[PDB]
Design a protein around this nucleic acid. Structure first.
Ligand SMILES: [Mg+2]
Ligand SMILES: [Mg+2]
Ligand SMILES: [Mg+2]
Ligand SMILES: [Mg+2]
Ligand SMILES: [Mg+2]
Ligand SMILES: [Mg+2]
Ligand SMILES: [Mg+2]
Ligand SMILES: [Mg+2]
Ligand SMILES: [Mg+2]
Ligand SMILES: [Mg+2]
Ligand SMILES: [Mg+2]
Ligand SMILES: [Mg+2]
Ligand SMILES: [Mg+2]
Ligand SMILES: [Mg+2]
Ligand SMILES: [Mg+2]
Ligand SMILES: [Mg+2]
Ligand SMILES: [Mg+2]
Ligand SMILES: [Mg+2]
Ligand SMILES: [Zn+2]
Ligand SMILES: [Zn+2]
Lengths: 25, 81, 151, 225, 129, 63, 102
RNA sequence: GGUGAAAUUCUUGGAUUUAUUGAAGACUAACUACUGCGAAAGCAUUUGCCAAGGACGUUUUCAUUAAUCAAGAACGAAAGUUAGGGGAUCGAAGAUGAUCAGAUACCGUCGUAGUCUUAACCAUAAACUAUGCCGACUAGGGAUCGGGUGGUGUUUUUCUUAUGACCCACUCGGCACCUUACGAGAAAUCAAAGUCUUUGGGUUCUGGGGGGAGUAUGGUCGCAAGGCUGAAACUUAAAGGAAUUG
RNA sequence: CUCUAACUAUAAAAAUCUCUCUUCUC
């Protein structure tokens, strides 16, 4: 992979999981 | 090259180089005894004079500020000393 | 070539001559030198101005060469030394000028950067002078006593 | 040639048999006062043509106006101002170069200096003028470039601004054009600037007319017969 | 000055479907706008030199019909932000107007050159054909 | 290619020594003319060596 | 590995340069890696001057020339043959192609 | 129009061009270079004001005030976020018409946020010269930029001197360049990447096989985007660098 | 041992690939 798009994928994963954190509270 | 005498550079070579790089750090400047076209008095001036040197006798500014030596006033006479 | 705050490496300076004693052709008296030094000081010119004027107008090469002592020391012995050394005072003057410019027009950021550089230099020099104890150990330079010392 | 859609959202005539011809006259300032012809729709009341003519501008080379070829790169726009019937007058409207000469002067290894200034004529014609100068390679120069300092550029621009202001504020636009055609201001600029920097190819350009007081009938009549 | 009633042909030559449009000295009065795509069928060849000759010959015919005899030329590329370069065809139109009876003089280029503005279409990486 | 005849005309044209040495001071104004610097060079060298000094006009045209 | 000692940019001591659009594909490129050609040409082609020459008013007309630089992205410069793909030791030769005609 | 070819789209309410004008915001073409300024980002119409700085000149002034620097701070491209102002161009999203097996991609047209601003956050970039800063030395050559040197110098031109602009020999500083190795490197190459096994000028900060992974977690700054800090379990004999021949 | 003048004008589409890797000593 281009490291750029792997970083983007992990970044979006982080955003989704932190929205999960926010919705859980 | 590869063999010199740094004690005894050629005087032409010595002045050829830059100051602060010679054997002894000597100044390039000098002092000129300048006389105004009006008054016969003698006024000493540093060659690279910074301020507008004025003869105390009369308001006859002799040398004007410049990057290098001050420019004389077209009528004075200078003596090297 | 140091130039703390700019990578400039110049060496613009002066190479004073090797002869410690006076030039052989000088006709002025060392004492008369001293009285003209003190009177120009009474006029208020700083010792740098004093030196440049005595070099331009008269055969005064270095007052240390002629009188055997240096201009600031002549002033101190004669009791005309300023409370703040001249270089420092010029630093305060420049710093306050930059401060006035900056407060006048906000968005200039390189002005702020140069102000930080000038404050660094002035703190440094003040530290030195306090170590040599020319300044009082409580002498401090921030903004307002700065403006008072500008006066 | 076809592939049409005709998204329209035969009473045909001959539209050029229904048209008149008119003459063009240049002011007394130039040599060849006649300029040429102009086709116009026929003058009928309720949109008389002479209403339409007043306002027209024509771009004409100075070579034709003067006969000589050295004015080839010049270019004057003349405005239609007075109509006499089958024949109409023109007053000066603008000056410019042919772009090709401008580019020929614009070369590498020699910085160009521009001077822009809005100046009011002696009479009322509010104008804007431009000046273009190029550094000249000296008569002995081995240096491969001919660049000018920024301070030299500022001084030269100030000098040219002063000269242009003087020339325009001296006389009226008729006299101003009579000065323009011999391009005397060019030699004046070179005169006052040759001490600073050589400045080859000084040229006054894009004389732009901005304002005109009311009409000045009498002078226009004086400029044409 | 042997009574050459003048005109300006004003060929506008793009990289497709060039133009020949003769008008009066002031430019207010058109004579035979007839263009490059007028006489060709492909719509790919609108820029082709043959379109230039065809358009030029018919506008020259209309020019003789009206009465214009001498023509000045305003060659213009697309200019503005687009390519600054004269269209391939328009030169052939110039040649034809030179040929067909018309007297020609005072050739000029009036391509509108901008002073660096109006960011050119295409994005950073630009056209990626 | 080289046949012996060619070697021989090369020899006899090469063995040709001209008459007077083309310097001789005989051509181009008796006693040569040169610039001041080489003149004083020979002077310092301490040789009589007849002479004709002249200027050079060191200014360089565009070239 | 550094392909070109001059880094193939020609910036070398400027930080950042304004970009200029390519003339064919309109790709923005730094104004120094912006291969550039003086397209000076006679307004009429030499093949058609004669028709103009003998069929025109204003005997001995100037016949001016059209002037413009062309700025290419290097992709266009290579494909449109403006710039060739030279060899190694021949890369460090910067003199133009020997003044095409002289 | 537009393209490799085409279509979408606008057009006898006359589109496209042909002229004059006027509005808006935009940018400052060509001058534009192995050239300049700045700490870096970055900086290109003119003019005035405001303050600032480098380098050069200095027989001017003080006398170690110096270098790098954890901690702390200021700037910090573009995109982004607030809010208010503007709203041309160009264009993420979306809408389209093509190509193709599919193409919600590359080409083609419209079009929102942004693009420009005004105060505040963001502090990341291949923020690259992939070369930390301050020092001293070491080889030949040229030009170029800034200053200052000397010409019995040239044209300048104001008769003549003065300037300016040039020519020469310089010198100090700056971006750099060319040739070479007699030094290095593994080489590509470097005039520093030399003065390093013949191993020591002063100094900060980083790395220890590749993945896992800049991920997990805890802090910490931020509204948010996210940034700084930062592993391990585990999995492998390679990954990688430069050059050679195909 | 004297010098600095020419010039043009293309791009449509083309995806994938199953083994088998084996010495240099006189
Ligand atoms: Mg391609
Ligand atoms: Mg720098
Ligand atoms: Mg290049
Ligand atoms: Mg219309
Ligand atoms: Mg410009
Ligand atoms: Mg510059
Ligand atoms: Mg820190
Ligand atoms: Mg932004
Ligand atoms: Mg589609
Ligand atoms: Mg899309
Ligand atoms: Mg698109
Ligand atoms: Mg659009
Ligand atoms: Mg980073
Ligand atoms: Mg590891
Ligand atoms: Mg990782
Ligand atoms: Mg975390
Ligand atoms: Mg490799
Ligand atoms: Mg398959
Ligand atoms: Zn006097
Ligand atoms: Zn391109």
């Amino acid at each position: 992979m281009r490291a750029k798009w792997r970083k983007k994928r992990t970044r979006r994963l982080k955003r989704k999981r932190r929205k999960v954190r926010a919705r859980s509270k | 090259v590869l063999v010199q005498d740094l004690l005894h550079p050629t005087a032409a070579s010595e002045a050829r180089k830059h100051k602060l790089k010679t054997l002894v750090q000597s100044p390039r400047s000098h002092f000129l005894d300048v006389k105004c076209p009006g008054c016969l008095n003698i006024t000493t001036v540093f060659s690279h004079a910074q301020t507008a040197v004025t003869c105390e006798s009369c308001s006859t500014v002799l040398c004007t500020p410049t990057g290098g030596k001050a420019k004389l006033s077209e009528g004075t006479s200078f003596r090297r000393k | 070539m140091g130039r703390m705050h700019s990578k400039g490496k110049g060496m613009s300076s002066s190479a004073i001559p090797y002869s410690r004693n006076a030039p052989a052709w000088f006709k002025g008296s060392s004492d008369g030198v001293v009285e003209q030094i003190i009177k120009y000081a009474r006029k208020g010119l700083t010792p740098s101005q004093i030196g440049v004027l005595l070099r331009d107008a008269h055969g005064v090469t270095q007052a240390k060469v002629i009188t055997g002592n240096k201009i600031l020391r002549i002033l101190k012995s004669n009791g005309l030394a300023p409370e703040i050394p001249e270089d420092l005072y010029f630093l305060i003057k420049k710093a306050v000028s930059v401060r006035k410019h900056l407060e006048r027009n906000r968005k200039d950021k390189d002005a702020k950067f140069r102000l930080i550089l000038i404050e660094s230099r002035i703190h440094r020099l003040a530290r030195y002078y306090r170590t040599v104890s020319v300044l009082p150990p409580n002498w401090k330079y921030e903004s307002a006593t700065a403006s008072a010392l500008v006066n | 040639a076809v592939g049409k859609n005709k998204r329209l959202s035969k009473r045909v005539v001959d539209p050029f048999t229904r048209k008149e011809w008119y003459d063009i006259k240049a002011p007394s300032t130039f040599e060849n006062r006649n300029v040429g012809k102009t086709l116009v729709n026929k003058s009928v009341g309720l949109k008389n043509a002479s209403d339409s003519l007043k306002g027209r501008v024509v771009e004409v080379c100075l070579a034709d106006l003067q006969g000589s070829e050295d004015h080839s790169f010049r270019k004057v726009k003349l405005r239609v101002d007075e109509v006499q019937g089958k024949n109409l007058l023109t007053n000066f409207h603008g000056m410019d170069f042919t772009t090709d000469k401008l580019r020929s002067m614009v070369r590498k290894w020699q910085t160009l200096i521009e001077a822009n200034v809005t100046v009011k004529t002696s009479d009322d014609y509010v104008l804007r003028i431009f000046a273009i100068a190029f550094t000249r390679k000296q008569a002995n120069q081995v240096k491969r470039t001919s660049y000018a300092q920024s301070s030299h550029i500022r001084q030269i621009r100030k000098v040219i601004s002063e000269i242009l202001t003087r020339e325009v504020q001296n006389s009226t636009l008729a006299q101003l054009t009579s000065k323009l055609i011999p391009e005397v201001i060019n030699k004046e600029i070179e005169n006052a600037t040759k001490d600073i920097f050589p400045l080859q190819n000084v040229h006054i350009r894009k004389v732009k007319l901005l304002k005109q007081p009311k009409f000045d009938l009498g002078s226009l009549l004086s400029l044409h017969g | 000055d042997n009574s050459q009633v003048f005109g300006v042909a004003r060929i506008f030559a793009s990289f497709n479907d060039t133009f020949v449009h003769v008008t009066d000295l002031s430019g207010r009065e058109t004579i035979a706008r007839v263009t490059g795509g007028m006489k060709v069928k492909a719509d790919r060849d609108e820029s082709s030199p043959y379109a230039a000759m065809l358009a030029a010959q018919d506008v020259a015919a209309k020019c003789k019909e009206v009465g214009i005899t001498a023509v000045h030329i305003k060659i213009r590329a697309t200019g503005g932000t687009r390519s600054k370069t004269p269209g391939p065809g328009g030169q052939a139109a110039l040649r034809a107007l030179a040929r067909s009876g018309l007297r020609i003089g005072r050739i000029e280029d009036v391509t509108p050159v901008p002073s660096d503005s109006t960011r050119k279409k295409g994005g950073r990486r630009g056209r990626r054909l | 290619i080289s046949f012996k005849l060619q070697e021989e005309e090369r020899e006899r044209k090469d063995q040709y020594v001209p008459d007077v040495s083309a310097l001789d001071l005989s051509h181009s104004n008796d006693v040569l003319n040169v610039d001041t610097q080489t003149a004083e060079l020979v002077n310092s060298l301490g040789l009589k060596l007849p002479l004709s000094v002249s200027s050079v006009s060191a200014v360089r045209d565009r070239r | 590995p550094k392909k070109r000692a001059s880094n193939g940019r020609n910036k070398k001591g400027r930080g950042h340069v304004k970009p200029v659009r390519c003339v064919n594909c309109s790709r923005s490129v730094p104004k120094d890696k912006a291969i550039k050609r003086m397209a000076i040409r006679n307004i009429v082609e030499a093949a058609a001057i004669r028709d103009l020459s003998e069929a025109s008013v204003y005997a001995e007309y100037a016949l001016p020339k059209t002037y413009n630089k062309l700025h290419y992205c290097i992709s266009c410069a290579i494909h449109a043959r403006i710039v060739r793909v030279r060899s190694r030791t021949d890369r460090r030769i910067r003199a133009p192609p020997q003044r095409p005609r002289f």
